[PDB]
Design an enzyme around this catalytic site. Structure first.
Site, PDB file in Angstrom:
ATOM      1  N   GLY A  73       9.731  11.692   1.509  1.00  0.00           N
ATOM      2  CA  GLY A  73      10.333  11.534   0.178  1.00  0.00           C
ATOM      3  C   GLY A  73       9.393  11.011  -0.892  1.00  0.00           C
ATOM      4  O   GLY A  73       9.214  11.637  -1.959  1.00  0.00           O
ATOM      5  N   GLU A  74       8.807   9.847  -0.619  1.00  0.00           N
ATOM      6  CA  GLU A  74       8.048   9.122  -1.637  1.00  0.00           C
ATOM      7  C   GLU A  74       6.560   9.398  -1.646  1.00  0.00           C
ATOM      8  O   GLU A  74       5.865   9.019  -2.596  1.00  0.00           O
ATOM      9  CB  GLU A  74       8.318   7.614  -1.517  1.00  0.00           C
ATOM     10  CG  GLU A  74       9.795   7.221  -1.837  1.00  0.00           C
ATOM     11  CD  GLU A  74      10.118   5.825  -1.345  1.00  0.00           C
ATOM     12  OE1 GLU A  74      10.234   4.922  -2.193  1.00  0.00           O
ATOM     13  OE2 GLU A  74      10.219   5.646  -0.113  1.00  0.00           O
ATOM     14  N   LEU A  75       6.065  10.059  -0.600  1.00  0.00           N
ATOM     15  CA  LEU A  75       4.640  10.403  -0.526  1.00  0.00           C
ATOM     16  C   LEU A  75       4.070  11.044  -1.805  1.00  0.00           C
ATOM     17  O   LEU A  75       3.065  10.562  -2.326  1.00  0.00           O
ATOM     18  CB  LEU A  75       4.316  11.279   0.690  1.00  0.00           C
ATOM     19  CG  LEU A  75       2.812  11.618   0.763  1.00  0.00           C
ATOM     20  CD1 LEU A  75       1.975  10.365   0.987  1.00  0.00           C
ATOM     21  CD2 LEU A  75       2.540  12.659   1.864  1.00  0.00           C
TER      22      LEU A  75
END
Ligand code: FES
Ligand code: FES
Ligand SMILES: [Cl-]
Ligand SMILES: [Cl-]
Ligand SMILES: [Cl-]
Ligand SMILES: [Mg+2]
Ligand SMILES: [Mg+2]
Ligand SMILES: [Mg+2]
Length: 907
Positions: free
Chosen positions: A868-870
């Protein structure tokens, strides 16, 4: 009133309307065409696109007087329906264009308008069309949408068969790793998935509609509230204030750190004594419609004593500043990072040192769907809340004491939702709707407009940062020093935790044996902090990845090669003293190197006197999980009809909780030969689904993915026949054997970071990546165009490629906005999509390139990490590094507005 006889979706409609009514209201409310989605209500997002007499118009800014007698209108419902899908809708499903799906009807209608005028568009034509028609998407980075239009056009033009728009099973039978479409896609592309506002229109008469009476100053003592005029206004039922709240009237931060100087009970549900930020909800008007409630809310009079407001971290943190929460210092938390030896002497004797002051600001999430929720008292006597919560169990416990209910007497449910990007890690409207439902005993519904979404939901918290590196001539990092001040607005929830992220992620990616740093959290009167995708990494790694390029510059070393020299390798530890679990960064850098070299040469070749091209690199790292020994639970159930329901509370922002569940379960169930269409997911509900945990910290694929895997494994064992094969449902019931089987998984090896040193093993799985940005700077205007983004990504193993590609493209687009255009600094000016720098399609390059370099994780399900946040960890650092490459100027404080870049250029 006027009669208008027109055709809508091929059917003659005998319409009775106010000439001044908005077409969006008429279609949605009078005709029940809730596939016409409404977000901004200001003509800026295209969600409400309809075709009117061959032209694509935004229905929210089209009054009925502009609709001629005999007009032809097409909405998504007229494009196609489930089991009668248009090629555009089939293409959207195949290309994964529906993430949250909130923009999907508008894009598809708009796309039909395009193909009806230009049957064979170039990609550039498609992009120009969506720019002109203001079709906005916050989830996908646009590329999949263009892919879908192109594929549809080929079919419509007879150049390709329609059957090619349908997914073909890999014949392997394996959907893990594939582009299998997500279960919710058909509903999203047909406008038959009901989001919170759609649900509101379909609730019974007797449902009360709420409007917020909100503070119009940033800081105050409240002296009284006069509701007298409001009560006399049309459709008004009552007005709710703190007096009607049955519990503490406070939301708890719940996991407030013991070294926090505040008790975590600072946030009111309805303001009583004080206003702490502009927009604070002071009262709720209950009326027969949103419009009547809003009208009456304007007449509620609040008597207050305005106080001086602290509108930045440095301002609130001054030694002299007045305590916003009397009895707690404004600087309410500090997190040291103390690794290895004292850094002072190492800096003194190092071959080279560099230092920078950096700023990343109050980025607004800007989902296309503004916040919405509803509540009611069940016949069972419980209070039910249906909202955009992405942590239903978490929020239950955060609000229950405040609303005055025991945990057993409240139920939270996640509605289908049009994106959050983390703002829904915080409660927003849940306690408000609960208080109103409890007080009135009636169903209540609350819809925020776009200005309320901007001003009165949480924000990425600004960080003022100073970071320093000491290194050898050969580039080997020796030590780091770090200082960060986190402006969390007035409400403490997860502020201390966000500050800890700075200890974990400033300088992440490299072996750095010696670190001394200190993060501080400060309460202000600017918007309260809620998680924003990346949660501490976009701030931390902007500083360290910019500083890495400064170190390379000072060494006369290529910035990619300086990273290669320092990147995690076996034996190294991360900033908290923990060994990385995989070592993929050297691999990724080696694979990127020739593409980077090629990009540099294109930049030098294609730069002109006025338009300077540059290439910039950065690394990103982030955990998959909440800190420490995070856990999840799932239930795998064999149903009477041979289908299998996998029960979880995996909350879907739009990222793909449905496909994550189905793809992970399918892989786990392969021994029993379970077709993917037979696998069902569950919408999150605190009463009837297990505590899988929140969809935050890029954790669900790892945590809940593992729990799903375990549950499915256990179901297999429950179904196994002695001798080989599996029992059917009927056989198990006749044998009085269980059919609903629990699985649990815990990140056993993880430990919380220490309060004194910051050291620990907070996550057992991380995500690793390497970004390359290619940009052009117009040196006369200071305008930067991002021409291409590349992300080398190590996700361990892909559960679903449509899901992961879309996640990366979406995060990269948010990175472009964070780098160049986005902020929430000016309460009024930044309260619109366009005002706040929302990236429309031309701002995002068509060239968004992903290279997966997957190193299977020891603790991930089938080796998967999260994703998600990569893509938002440091793309903005790569972009700023590219601006420096192009022009020689470094922007230290985001965003790189044209005027800021010009001032730097001309300095
Ligand atoms: S343009 Fe109509 S809702 Fe945004
Ligand atoms: S899929 Fe476009 S806004 Fe979410
Ligand atoms: Cl954040
Ligand atoms: Cl700057
Ligand atoms: Cl500007
Ligand atoms: Mg057809
Ligand atoms: Mg070494
Ligand atoms: Mg100027």
């Amino acid at each position: 009133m006027i009669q208008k006889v027109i055709t809508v979706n091929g059917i003659e409609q005998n319409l009775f309307v106010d000439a001044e009514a908005l077409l969006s209201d008429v279609l949605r409310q009078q005709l029940g065409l809730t596939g016409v989605k409404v977000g901004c209500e200001q003509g800026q997002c295209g969600a409400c696109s309809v075709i009117l007499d061959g032209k694509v118009v935004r229905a929210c800014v089209t009054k009925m007087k502009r609709v001629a007698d005999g007009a032809q209108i097409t909405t998504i419902e007229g494009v196609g329906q489930p089991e009668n899908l248009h090629p555009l809708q089939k293409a959207w499903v195949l290309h994964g264009g529906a993430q949250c799906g909130f923009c999907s009807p508008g894009f598809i209608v708009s796309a039909k308008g395009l193909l009806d005028t230009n049957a064979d568009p170039s990609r550039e034509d498609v992009r120009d069309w969506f720019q002109k028609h203001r079709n906005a998407c916050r989830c996908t980075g646009y590329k999949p949408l263009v892919d879908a239009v192109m594929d549809a056009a080929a079919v419509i033009n007879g150049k390709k068969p329609e059957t090619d728009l349908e997914f073909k099973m890999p014949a392997d039978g394996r959907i893990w790793g594939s582009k299998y479409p997500r279960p919710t896609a058909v509903a999203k592309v047909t406008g038959t998935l009901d989001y919170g506002a759609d649900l509101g229109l379909k609730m019974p008469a007797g449902t009360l509609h709420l409007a917020m009476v909100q503070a119009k100053v940033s800081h105050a003592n409240i002296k009284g509230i006069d509701t007298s005029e409001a009560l006399t206004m049309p459709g008004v039922h009552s007005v709710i204030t703190h007096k009607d709240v049955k519990g503490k009237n406070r939301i708890t931060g719940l996991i407030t750190f013991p070294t926090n100087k505040g008790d975590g009970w600072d946030r009111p549900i309805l303001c009583d004594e004080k206003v702490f930020q502009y927009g604070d909800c002071i009262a709720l008007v209950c009326a027969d419609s949103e419009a009547n409630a809003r009208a009456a809310a304007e007449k509620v009079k609040v008597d207050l004593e305005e106080l001086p407001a602290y509108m930045s971290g440095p301002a609130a943190a001054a030694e002299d500043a007045i305590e916003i929460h009397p009895g707690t210092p404004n600087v309410y938390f500090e997190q040291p990072i103390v690794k290895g030896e004292d850094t002072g002497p190492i800096f003194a004797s190092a071959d080279v040192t560099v230092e920078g002051d950096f700023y990343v600001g109050r980025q607004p999430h800007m989902p296309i769907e503004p916040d919405v929720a509803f509540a009611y008292m069940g016949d069972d006597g419980k209070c039910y809340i249906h909202s955009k919560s992405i942590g239903v169990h978490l929020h239950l416990y955060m609000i229950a004491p405040g609303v005055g209910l025991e945990p057993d007497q409240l139920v939270l449910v996640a509605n289908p939702m049009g994106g959050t990007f983390g703002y829904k890690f915080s409660p927003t409207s849940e306690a408000l709707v609960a208080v109103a439902a409890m007080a009135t005993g009636r169903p209540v519904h609350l819809r925020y407009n776009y200005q309320q979404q901007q001003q009165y939901t949480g924000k990425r918290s600004p960080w003022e940062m100073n970071v320093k590196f000491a290194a050898k001539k050969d580039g080997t990092l020796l030590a780091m020093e770090s200082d960060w001040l986190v402006d969390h607005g007035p409400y403490s929830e997860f502020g201390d935790l966000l500050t800890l992220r700075g200890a974990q992620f400033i300088g992440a990616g490299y072996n750095i044996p010696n670190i001394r740093g200190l993060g501080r959290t400060v309460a202000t009167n600017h918007v309260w902090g809620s998680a924003f995708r990346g949660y501490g990494a976009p701030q931390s790694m902007f500083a360290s990845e910019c500083l890495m390029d400064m170190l390379a510059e000072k060494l006369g070393m290529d910035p990619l090669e300086l990273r290669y020299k320092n990147a995690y390798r076996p034996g190294d530890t991360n900033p908290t003293g923990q060994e990385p679990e995989v070592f993929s960064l050297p691999d990724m850098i080696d694979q990127l190197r020739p593409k980077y070299q090629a990009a540099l040469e294109k930049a030098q070749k294609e730069s002109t006197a006025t338009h300077k091209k540059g290439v910039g690199i950065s690394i990103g790292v982030y955990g998959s999980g909440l800190d420490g020994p995070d856990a999840s639970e799932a239930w795998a159930e064999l149903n009477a009809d041979g289908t299998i329901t996998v029960h979880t509370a995996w909350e879907d922002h739009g990222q793909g909780a449905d496909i994550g569940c189905v793809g992970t379960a399918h892989e786990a169930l392969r021994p029993m030969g379970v077709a993917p269409e037979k696998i069902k997911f569950t919408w999150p509900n605190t009463a009837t689904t297990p505590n899988s945990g929140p969809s935050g910290g890029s954790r669900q694929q790892v945590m809940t993915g593992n729990a799903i895997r375990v549950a499915c494994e256990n179901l297999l064992k429950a179904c196994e026949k002695p001798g080989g094969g599996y029992y059917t449902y009927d056989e198990l019931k006749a044998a009085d054997k269980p059919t609903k089987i629990t699985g649990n998984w815990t990140a056993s090896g993880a430990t919380h970071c220490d309060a004194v040193t910051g050291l620990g093993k907070p996550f057992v799985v991380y995500m690793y990546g390497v970004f390359m940005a290619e940009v052009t700077v117009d040196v006369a205007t200071g305008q930067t165009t991002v021409d291409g983004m590349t992300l080398m990504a190590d996700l361990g193993s892909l559960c679903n490629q449509l899901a992961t590609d879309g996640q990366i493209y979406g995060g990269l687009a948010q990175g472009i906005g964070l780098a160049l255009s986005e902020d929430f600094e000016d309460i009024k000016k930044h309260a619109t999509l366009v005002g706040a720098g929302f990236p429309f399609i031309k701002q995002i390059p068509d060239k968004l390139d992903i290279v997966y370099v997957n190193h299977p994780r020891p603790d991930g399900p089938f080796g998967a990490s999260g994703v998600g946040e990569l893509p938002l960890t440091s793309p903005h650092a790569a972009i700023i590094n590219a601006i420096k490459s192009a022009t020689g100027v470094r922007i230290y404080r985001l965003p790189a507005y044209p005027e800021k870049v010009l001032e730097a250029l001309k300095a």
